[PDB]
Write a protein that binds this ligand. Structure first.
Ligand SMILES: [Cl-]
Ligand SMILES: [Cl-]
Ligand code: NA
Ligand code: NA
Lengths: 217, 217
């Protein structure tokens, strides 16, 4: 085998803060936390105070692979800018890969060979946050439908050939209410939107992404 | 021109609850809310109580188009299952398209010609929620990197040719701490993760999506 697995269930004998690699390929992870490990998802889990707690992994654990996967379970107790993991060159400070929590619950992965300003990144999608004004749009273009939040593409379904059109002349429309469908399992029937709405707009074509962006300005 | 635009700034003369289409192509939107319109994003905005308030749009506004866009601004005051808009056949209850808010701030768009159980949908991406255990994974396969939350793909960057590899033998790794980069604008330096972590795993290849799913079980 290759790779590692930290289950963080119980310190190794002889210590209070060392946790083994269950795959038996790498050294012990070291925990710096006054909490220690506590009941969590699978047996025990690391609990970090968000102040100065972290885990040191042994050197070399990820720098010898061309392709790879890093995976773990996490319970985020504070929404904000925070490092989740960071694997970096011991010889310089501008060669690294780091997964971060973002200003809003999104996550970002960055790899760079030229410091902070050269990061190549991947960022997760936006969602609707409580009490925060956002722009939403749906576009249908042939078989492809697209969802946008603040002018960013957040989903597609390229298999949409479909209902109202034509004989849509007498179609009904609500904002914030649904009509009664054919199913009592519909959870939206009799649910009413709690919020505010503005500039409701409809177009008889599919706007492009930067067209969408411009509305979201 | 074609299409509509409801700015919801001021009731039309002679009424208390009618709002015109600024494009002058469709009838008045009708508001059912004891709140009326109030200061919002652009001038005034509709405020729905989440109990029984909604807006009726005039019949036909969207059922005569092959391709289209629906776009608006929204401020969601309660996270949960709620209809945002619904355009449906006046002759049956199983021919409609509806945009909904979901259990967690995501949004879903559905079109159907065969009732609730036949909905074809588009759903926005997951994010990390406060106090909620989630599975996260990053995979690098050739030039393509992928982010996953609970086994669902939430971002990619097909242009990743890059840093540690090789000479990665002495690379350093943290969970919950970042090293100091070359920039004082780095907001992650000196930030510490507030949360829990379990089953931290590393692989020297890129797992497939259902492989990822299986870890997220
Ligand atoms: Cl263990
Ligand atoms: Cl108006
Ligand atoms: Na564990
Ligand atoms: Na307005």
């Amino acid at each position: 085998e290759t790779g590692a697995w930290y289950m963080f269930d119980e310190a190794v004998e002889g210590s209070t803060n060392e946790f083994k690699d269950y795959k038996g390929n790498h050294g012990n992870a070291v925990l710096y936390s006054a909490n220690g490990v506590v009941p969590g998802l699978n047996g025990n889990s690391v609990s970090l105070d968000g102040v100065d707690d972290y885990v040191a992994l042994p050197d070399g654990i990820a720098g010898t692979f061309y392709n790879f996967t890093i995976a773990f379970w996490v319970r985020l107790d504070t929404i904000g800018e925070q490092p989740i993991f960071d694997f970096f060159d011991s010889g310089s400070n501008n060669k690294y890969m780091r997964l971060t929590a973002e200003s809003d619950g999104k996550i970002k992965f960055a790899m760079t060979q030229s410091g902070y300003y050269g990061e190549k990144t991947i960022t997760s999608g936006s969602a609707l946050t409580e009490g925060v004004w956002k722009h939403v749009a749906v576009t249908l273009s042939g078989d492809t439908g697209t969802l946008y939040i603040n002018g960013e593409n957040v989903g597609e379904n390229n298999t949409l050939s479909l209902p109202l059109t034509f004989l849509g002349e007498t179609s009904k429309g609500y904002i914030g209410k649904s009509h009664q469908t054919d199913s009592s399992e519909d959870p939206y029937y009799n649910s009413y939107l709690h919020g505010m709405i503005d500039d409701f707009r409809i177009f008889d074509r599919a706007l492009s992404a930067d067209e969408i962006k411009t509305l979201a300005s």
